[PDB]
Structures are given as C-alpha cells and as structure tokens.
Amino acid sequence: CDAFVGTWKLVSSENFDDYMKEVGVGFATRKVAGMAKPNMIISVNGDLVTIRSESTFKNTEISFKLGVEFDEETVDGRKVKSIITLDGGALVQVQKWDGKSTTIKRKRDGDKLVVECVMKGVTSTRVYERA
Ligand SMILES: CCCCCCCC/C=C\CCCCCCCC(=O)O
C-alpha cells in the first residue's frame, strides 16, 4: 500500500452524481459534494492505513487495519461498516449500512490513483494525480 502513499488531487470525475444518487445521497449534498475537487491523503503507519479527503465542504478521515471491519461516517452523513482489503494491487473497500452495500476500489493506474465506486450496477470513476 506504499504505492498509494501521498497526497492526490482530483482531475476528472465520471458518473459520480449518478453513483451518489444510487447510494441515496440527498440533492443538496450531491451538488455541494460534486462541486468539489477534493484532495485525498493516504498514509501508512505500521499496519494502520489512513485515508483522508479534504475539501471546502467537509473533510473525512478513516484509519484502519486492512481486513478488520470498522465504523465510518461518510462525507454524505451515513454511518457504515467498512472493510478494506488489499487485492491484486488495489485497495478494495466495501461499505455496508441499512441492509445496503457499495464497493469503492482505489487503484494505481499509471501515475494516477483511480477511484471506482459501484452501487447496484451504477459505477463512477474518479481519477487523481499526485498533488
Ligand atoms: C456525497 C458523496 C458520498 C460518497 C463519498 C465517497 C466518494 C469516494 C470516491 C472518490 C473520492 C471522492 C472525494 C472524497 C469525497 C469527498 C467529497 C467532498 O465533499 O469534497
């Protein structure tokens, strides 16, 4: 997960609003949340990985052990159970809440960090470049 370490900047987003809507995010949040060009800061300390997202709207931060389920309060306000594992070079995150589930995969693609989100078939792709 050292290949993910660093600060990243959003450079392109595709279908993110559709994803949020499939997730159930409210109109206001979707608008403000989508307005953003958040920075993602990933760091590793021992077996604890931290993924931070910063923007003018809201900052988020989760610290976890890969493979151990934990509580996460998403940027849109959901309180979910997340599990993040390292598979094939990608960080695969699954969030579960109110009987629903969504997958967020973070992978390295060339010199970029690509975030793919999936909810009920609706998928969004966000590309980040080193800040
Ligand atoms: C309202 C969105 C809820 C889902 C948030 C998780 C998005 C994961 C995918 C790509 C990283 C996007 C940047 C992090 C979200 C913060 C957005 C913000 O408020 O600036």
Side-chain angles (χ1 to χ4, degrees):
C1 32
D2 289 310
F4 288 98
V5 178
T7 300
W8 306 83
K9 299 180 301 185
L10 179 65
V11 303
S12 96
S13 183
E14 163 181 89
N15 304 311
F16 189 53
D17 193 288
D18 289 315
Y19 170 71
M20 301 197 269
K21 163 67 176 175
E22 199 56 56
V23 166
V25 183
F27 183 75
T29 299
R30 293 210 308 281
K31 295 310 294 280
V32 59
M35 238 160 290
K37 166 181 170 170
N39 287 163
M40 186 178 261
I41 310 171
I42 301 180
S43 57
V44 300
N45 188 325
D47 47 53
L48 224 52
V49 183
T50 301
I51 297 172
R52 186 183 163 71
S53 174
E54 311 183 324
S55 77
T56 61
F57 174 53
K58 286 185 177 177
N59 295 158
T60 63
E61 182 179 309
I62 55 174
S63 293
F64 51 94
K65 177 184 180 181
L66 291 168
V68 177
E69 181 177 58
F70 64 99
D71 301 295
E72 166 181 23
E73 193 191 314
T74 66
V75 74
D76 59 300
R78 293 170 284 144
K79 290 190 294 184
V80 311
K81 290 297 190 182
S82 297
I83 308 171
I84 302 176
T85 56
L86 193 55
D87 309 306
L91 290 170
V92 189
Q93 166 171 30
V94 179
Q95 299 178 321
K96 292 196 168 188
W97 78 102
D98 305 322
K100 306 176 192 181
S101 69
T102 184
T103 296
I104 299 166
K105 306 199 177 188
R106 294 176 172 81
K107 50 187 168 309
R108 287 303 314 288
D109 189 335
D111 58 14
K112 308 282 183 299
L113 187 173
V114 172
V115 185
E116 165 169 61
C117 305
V118 188
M119 173 66 172
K120 289 187 174 187
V122 179
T123 60
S124 170
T125 306
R126 289 156 74 76
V127 186
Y128 287 75
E129 68 168 345
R130 282 192 189 285

PDB file of all heavy atoms in Angstrom, residues 16 20 25 29 33 36 38 40 53 55 57-58 75-76 78 104 115 117 126 128, ligand 1:
ATOM      1  N   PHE A  16     -20.200  10.411 -11.053  1.00  0.00           N
ATOM      2  CA  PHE A  16     -20.207  10.450  -9.594  1.00  0.00           C
ATOM      3  C   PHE A  16     -21.576  10.828  -9.036  1.00  0.00           C
ATOM      4  O   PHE A  16     -22.029  10.261  -8.045  1.00  0.00           O
ATOM      5  CB  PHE A  16     -19.135  11.407  -9.069  1.00  0.00           C
ATOM      6  CG  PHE A  16     -18.938  11.326  -7.578  1.00  0.00           C
ATOM      7  CD1 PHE A  16     -18.685  10.100  -6.965  1.00  0.00           C
ATOM      8  CD2 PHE A  16     -19.015  12.469  -6.788  1.00  0.00           C
ATOM      9  CE1 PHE A  16     -18.513  10.009  -5.581  1.00  0.00           C
ATOM     10  CE2 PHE A  16     -18.846  12.392  -5.404  1.00  0.00           C
ATOM     11  CZ  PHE A  16     -18.596  11.159  -4.801  1.00  0.00           C
ATOM     12  N   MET A  20     -23.835   8.661  -6.386  1.00  0.00           N
ATOM     13  CA  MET A  20     -24.377   9.180  -5.133  1.00  0.00           C
ATOM     14  C   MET A  20     -25.896   9.005  -5.034  1.00  0.00           C
ATOM     15  O   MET A  20     -26.433   8.734  -3.967  1.00  0.00           O
ATOM     16  CB  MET A  20     -24.018  10.667  -4.969  1.00  0.00           C
ATOM     17  CG  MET A  20     -22.524  10.968  -4.972  1.00  0.00           C
ATOM     18  SD  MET A  20     -22.120  12.619  -4.302  1.00  0.00           S
ATOM     19  CE  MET A  20     -22.166  13.648  -5.801  1.00  0.00           C
ATOM     20  N   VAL A  25     -27.700   9.585  -1.586  1.00  0.00           N
ATOM     21  CA  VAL A  25     -27.278  10.906  -1.121  1.00  0.00           C
ATOM     22  C   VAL A  25     -28.314  11.969  -1.533  1.00  0.00           C
ATOM     23  O   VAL A  25     -28.856  11.929  -2.641  1.00  0.00           O
ATOM     24  CB  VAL A  25     -25.883  11.290  -1.705  1.00  0.00           C
ATOM     25  CG1 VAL A  25     -25.435  12.636  -1.153  1.00  0.00           C
ATOM     26  CG2 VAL A  25     -24.850  10.216  -1.365  1.00  0.00           C
ATOM     27  N   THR A  29     -26.389  17.755  -0.773  1.00  0.00           N
ATOM     28  CA  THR A  29     -25.066  17.167  -0.610  1.00  0.00           C
ATOM     29  C   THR A  29     -24.469  16.803  -1.959  1.00  0.00           C
ATOM     30  O   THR A  29     -23.320  17.131  -2.235  1.00  0.00           O
ATOM     31  CB  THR A  29     -25.117  15.915   0.275  1.00  0.00           C
ATOM     32  OG1 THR A  29     -25.593  16.277   1.575  1.00  0.00           O
ATOM     33  CG2 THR A  29     -23.732  15.294   0.403  1.00  0.00           C
ATOM     34  N   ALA A  33     -21.131  18.322  -2.778  1.00  0.00           N
ATOM     35  CA  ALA A  33     -20.122  17.265  -2.807  1.00  0.00           C
ATOM     36  C   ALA A  33     -19.542  17.087  -4.206  1.00  0.00           C
ATOM     37  O   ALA A  33     -18.355  16.784  -4.380  1.00  0.00           O
ATOM     38  CB  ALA A  33     -20.733  15.948  -2.318  1.00  0.00           C
ATOM     39  N   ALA A  36     -16.926  19.857  -5.670  1.00  0.00           N
ATOM     40  CA  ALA A  36     -15.538  19.706  -5.243  1.00  0.00           C
ATOM     41  C   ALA A  36     -14.469  19.006  -6.066  1.00  0.00           C
ATOM     42  O   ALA A  36     -14.735  18.168  -6.925  1.00  0.00           O
ATOM     43  CB  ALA A  36     -15.525  19.139  -3.821  1.00  0.00           C
ATOM     44  N   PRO A  38     -11.697  17.582  -4.318  1.00  0.00           N
ATOM     45  CA  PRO A  38     -11.056  17.127  -3.085  1.00  0.00           C
ATOM     46  C   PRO A  38      -9.669  16.547  -3.286  1.00  0.00           C
ATOM     47  O   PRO A  38      -9.302  16.083  -4.377  1.00  0.00           O
ATOM     48  CB  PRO A  38     -12.023  16.066  -2.547  1.00  0.00           C
ATOM     49  CG  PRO A  38     -13.319  16.372  -3.220  1.00  0.00           C
ATOM     50  CD  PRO A  38     -12.897  16.776  -4.602  1.00  0.00           C
ATOM     51  N   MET A  40      -6.972  13.750  -1.718  1.00  0.00           N
ATOM     52  CA  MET A  40      -7.009  12.521  -0.954  1.00  0.00           C
ATOM     53  C   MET A  40      -5.601  12.310  -0.433  1.00  0.00           C
ATOM     54  O   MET A  40      -4.646  12.303  -1.208  1.00  0.00           O
ATOM     55  CB  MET A  40      -7.431  11.358  -1.851  1.00  0.00           C
ATOM     56  CG  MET A  40      -7.642  10.067  -1.095  1.00  0.00           C
ATOM     57  SD  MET A  40      -8.179   8.763  -2.180  1.00  0.00           S
ATOM     58  CE  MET A  40      -9.921   8.779  -1.879  1.00  0.00           C
ATOM     59  N   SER A  53      -9.641  12.797   3.138  1.00  0.00           N
ATOM     60  CA  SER A  53     -10.137  13.531   1.985  1.00  0.00           C
ATOM     61  C   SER A  53     -10.436  14.935   2.472  1.00  0.00           C
ATOM     62  O   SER A  53     -11.129  15.115   3.468  1.00  0.00           O
ATOM     63  CB  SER A  53     -11.412  12.898   1.442  1.00  0.00           C
ATOM     64  OG  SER A  53     -11.954  13.712   0.418  1.00  0.00           O
ATOM     65  N   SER A  55     -11.686  18.989   1.443  1.00  0.00           N
ATOM     66  CA  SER A  55     -12.360  19.885   0.515  1.00  0.00           C
ATOM     67  C   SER A  55     -12.955  21.008   1.344  1.00  0.00           C
ATOM     68  O   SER A  55     -12.946  20.959   2.578  1.00  0.00           O
ATOM     69  CB  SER A  55     -13.471  19.165  -0.246  1.00  0.00           C
ATOM     70  OG  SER A  55     -14.626  18.989   0.557  1.00  0.00           O
ATOM     71  N   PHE A  57     -16.028  21.719   1.538  1.00  0.00           N
ATOM     72  CA  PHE A  57     -17.298  21.259   2.109  1.00  0.00           C
ATOM     73  C   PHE A  57     -17.072  20.534   3.431  1.00  0.00           C
ATOM     74  O   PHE A  57     -17.430  21.039   4.497  1.00  0.00           O
ATOM     75  CB  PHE A  57     -18.008  20.328   1.117  1.00  0.00           C
ATOM     76  CG  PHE A  57     -19.261  19.678   1.661  1.00  0.00           C
ATOM     77  CD1 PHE A  57     -20.280  20.445   2.220  1.00  0.00           C
ATOM     78  CD2 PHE A  57     -19.432  18.289   1.590  1.00  0.00           C
ATOM     79  CE1 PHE A  57     -21.454  19.844   2.697  1.00  0.00           C
ATOM     80  CE2 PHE A  57     -20.599  17.681   2.064  1.00  0.00           C
ATOM     81  CZ  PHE A  57     -21.610  18.457   2.618  1.00  0.00           C
ATOM     82  N   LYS A  58     -16.478  19.345   3.353  1.00  0.00           N
ATOM     83  CA  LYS A  58     -16.192  18.549   4.538  1.00  0.00           C
ATOM     84  C   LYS A  58     -14.937  17.716   4.340  1.00  0.00           C
ATOM     85  O   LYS A  58     -14.613  17.318   3.222  1.00  0.00           O
ATOM     86  CB  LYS A  58     -17.353  17.602   4.852  1.00  0.00           C
ATOM     87  CG  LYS A  58     -18.591  18.247   5.454  1.00  0.00           C
ATOM     88  CD  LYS A  58     -19.606  17.164   5.814  1.00  0.00           C
ATOM     89  CE  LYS A  58     -20.838  17.728   6.492  1.00  0.00           C
ATOM     90  NZ  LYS A  58     -21.806  16.622   6.734  1.00  0.00           N
ATOM     91  N   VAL A  75     -18.730  11.101   4.097  1.00  0.00           N
ATOM     92  CA  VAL A  75     -18.840  12.527   3.840  1.00  0.00           C
ATOM     93  C   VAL A  75     -20.292  12.972   3.624  1.00  0.00           C
ATOM     94  O   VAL A  75     -20.623  14.129   3.871  1.00  0.00           O
ATOM     95  CB  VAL A  75     -17.971  12.927   2.620  1.00  0.00           C
ATOM     96  CG1 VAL A  75     -18.617  12.463   1.349  1.00  0.00           C
ATOM     97  CG2 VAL A  75     -17.742  14.435   2.602  1.00  0.00           C
ATOM     98  N   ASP A  76     -21.159  12.062   3.176  1.00  0.00           N
ATOM     99  CA  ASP A  76     -22.562  12.413   2.950  1.00  0.00           C
ATOM    100  C   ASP A  76     -23.424  12.166   4.183  1.00  0.00           C
ATOM    101  O   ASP A  76     -24.646  12.340   4.141  1.00  0.00           O
ATOM    102  CB  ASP A  76     -23.140  11.646   1.762  1.00  0.00           C
ATOM    103  CG  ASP A  76     -23.055  10.151   1.939  1.00  0.00           C
ATOM    104  OD1 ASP A  76     -21.930   9.642   2.079  1.00  0.00           O
ATOM    105  OD2 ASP A  76     -24.106   9.490   1.933  1.00  0.00           O
ATOM    106  N   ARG A  78     -23.639   9.104   6.134  1.00  0.00           N
ATOM    107  CA  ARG A  78     -24.038   7.753   6.510  1.00  0.00           C
ATOM    108  C   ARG A  78     -23.087   7.203   7.560  1.00  0.00           C
ATOM    109  O   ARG A  78     -21.926   7.583   7.605  1.00  0.00           O
ATOM    110  CB  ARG A  78     -23.992   6.813   5.306  1.00  0.00           C
ATOM    111  CG  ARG A  78     -24.994   7.086   4.214  1.00  0.00           C
ATOM    112  CD  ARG A  78     -24.640   6.237   3.001  1.00  0.00           C
ATOM    113  NE  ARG A  78     -23.496   6.790   2.286  1.00  0.00           N
ATOM    114  CZ  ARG A  78     -22.545   6.073   1.695  1.00  0.00           C
ATOM    115  NH1 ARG A  78     -22.575   4.751   1.727  1.00  0.00           N
ATOM    116  NH2 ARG A  78     -21.561   6.687   1.055  1.00  0.00           N
ATOM    117  N   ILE A 104     -15.924   0.404  -3.214  1.00  0.00           N
ATOM    118  CA  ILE A 104     -15.082   1.516  -3.628  1.00  0.00           C
ATOM    119  C   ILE A 104     -13.686   0.932  -3.779  1.00  0.00           C
ATOM    120  O   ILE A 104     -13.086   0.496  -2.797  1.00  0.00           O
ATOM    121  CB  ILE A 104     -15.033   2.627  -2.547  1.00  0.00           C
ATOM    122  CG1 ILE A 104     -16.435   3.180  -2.297  1.00  0.00           C
ATOM    123  CG2 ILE A 104     -14.103   3.741  -2.981  1.00  0.00           C
ATOM    124  CD1 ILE A 104     -16.525   4.020  -1.049  1.00  0.00           C
ATOM    125  N   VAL A 115     -10.211   5.962  -8.497  1.00  0.00           N
ATOM    126  CA  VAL A 115     -11.209   5.507  -7.555  1.00  0.00           C
ATOM    127  C   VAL A 115     -12.471   5.090  -8.302  1.00  0.00           C
ATOM    128  O   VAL A 115     -13.113   5.902  -8.958  1.00  0.00           O
ATOM    129  CB  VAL A 115     -11.549   6.613  -6.540  1.00  0.00           C
ATOM    130  CG1 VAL A 115     -12.508   6.078  -5.503  1.00  0.00           C
ATOM    131  CG2 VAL A 115     -10.277   7.115  -5.878  1.00  0.00           C
ATOM    132  N   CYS A 117     -16.215   3.488  -7.915  1.00  0.00           N
ATOM    133  CA  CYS A 117     -17.296   3.231  -6.969  1.00  0.00           C
ATOM    134  C   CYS A 117     -18.420   2.492  -7.683  1.00  0.00           C
ATOM    135  O   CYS A 117     -18.714   2.768  -8.845  1.00  0.00           O
ATOM    136  CB  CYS A 117     -17.814   4.554  -6.398  1.00  0.00           C
ATOM    137  SG  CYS A 117     -16.540   5.602  -5.637  1.00  0.00           S
ATOM    138  N   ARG A 126     -13.274   8.151 -10.744  1.00  0.00           N
ATOM    139  CA  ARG A 126     -12.621   9.408 -10.451  1.00  0.00           C
ATOM    140  C   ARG A 126     -11.122   9.211 -10.502  1.00  0.00           C
ATOM    141  O   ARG A 126     -10.587   8.297  -9.890  1.00  0.00           O
ATOM    142  CB  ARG A 126     -13.090   9.920  -9.088  1.00  0.00           C
ATOM    143  CG  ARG A 126     -14.540  10.392  -9.157  1.00  0.00           C
ATOM    144  CD  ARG A 126     -15.225  10.368  -7.822  1.00  0.00           C
ATOM    145  NE  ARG A 126     -14.801  11.439  -6.928  1.00  0.00           N
ATOM    146  CZ  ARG A 126     -15.182  12.707  -7.023  1.00  0.00           C
ATOM    147  NH1 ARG A 126     -15.999  13.094  -7.986  1.00  0.00           N
ATOM    148  NH2 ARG A 126     -14.764  13.587  -6.123  1.00  0.00           N
ATOM    149  N   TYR A 128      -7.259  10.692  -9.938  1.00  0.00           N
ATOM    150  CA  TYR A 128      -6.453  11.598  -9.133  1.00  0.00           C
ATOM    151  C   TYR A 128      -4.994  11.575  -9.576  1.00  0.00           C
ATOM    152  O   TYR A 128      -4.471  10.532  -9.958  1.00  0.00           O
ATOM    153  CB  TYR A 128      -6.490  11.193  -7.653  1.00  0.00           C
ATOM    154  CG  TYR A 128      -7.783  11.468  -6.924  1.00  0.00           C
ATOM    155  CD1 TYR A 128      -8.911  10.671  -7.123  1.00  0.00           C
ATOM    156  CD2 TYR A 128      -7.872  12.532  -6.027  1.00  0.00           C
ATOM    157  CE1 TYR A 128     -10.104  10.931  -6.439  1.00  0.00           C
ATOM    158  CE2 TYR A 128      -9.047  12.803  -5.344  1.00  0.00           C
ATOM    159  CZ  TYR A 128     -10.156  12.004  -5.552  1.00  0.00           C
ATOM    160  OH  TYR A 128     -11.314  12.298  -4.876  1.00  0.00           O
TER     161      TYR A 128
HETATM  162  C1  LIG B   1     -21.570  12.572  -1.011  1.00  0.00           C
HETATM  163  C2  LIG B   1     -20.528  11.581  -1.521  1.00  0.00           C
HETATM  164  C3  LIG B   1     -20.547  10.325  -0.638  1.00  0.00           C
HETATM  165  C4  LIG B   1     -19.532   9.262  -1.045  1.00  0.00           C
HETATM  166  C5  LIG B   1     -18.115   9.741  -0.724  1.00  0.00           C
HETATM  167  C6  LIG B   1     -17.046   8.744  -1.134  1.00  0.00           C
HETATM  168  C7  LIG B   1     -16.553   9.055  -2.522  1.00  0.00           C
HETATM  169  C8  LIG B   1     -15.470   8.086  -2.924  1.00  0.00           C
HETATM  170  C9  LIG B   1     -14.973   8.371  -4.267  1.00  0.00           C
HETATM  171  C10 LIG B   1     -13.991   9.314  -4.643  1.00  0.00           C
HETATM  172  C11 LIG B   1     -13.288  10.199  -3.752  1.00  0.00           C
HETATM  173  C12 LIG B   1     -14.081  11.489  -3.780  1.00  0.00           C
HETATM  174  C13 LIG B   1     -13.557  12.566  -2.852  1.00  0.00           C
HETATM  175  C14 LIG B   1     -13.911  12.231  -1.400  1.00  0.00           C
HETATM  176  C15 LIG B   1     -15.363  12.583  -1.074  1.00  0.00           C
HETATM  177  C16 LIG B   1     -15.392  13.985  -0.526  1.00  0.00           C
HETATM  178  C17 LIG B   1     -16.197  14.922  -1.400  1.00  0.00           C
HETATM  179  C18 LIG B   1     -16.201  16.314  -0.835  1.00  0.00           C
HETATM  180  O1  LIG B   1     -17.045  16.655  -0.011  1.00  0.00           O
HETATM  181  O2  LIG B   1     -15.349  17.100  -1.215  1.00  0.00           O
END
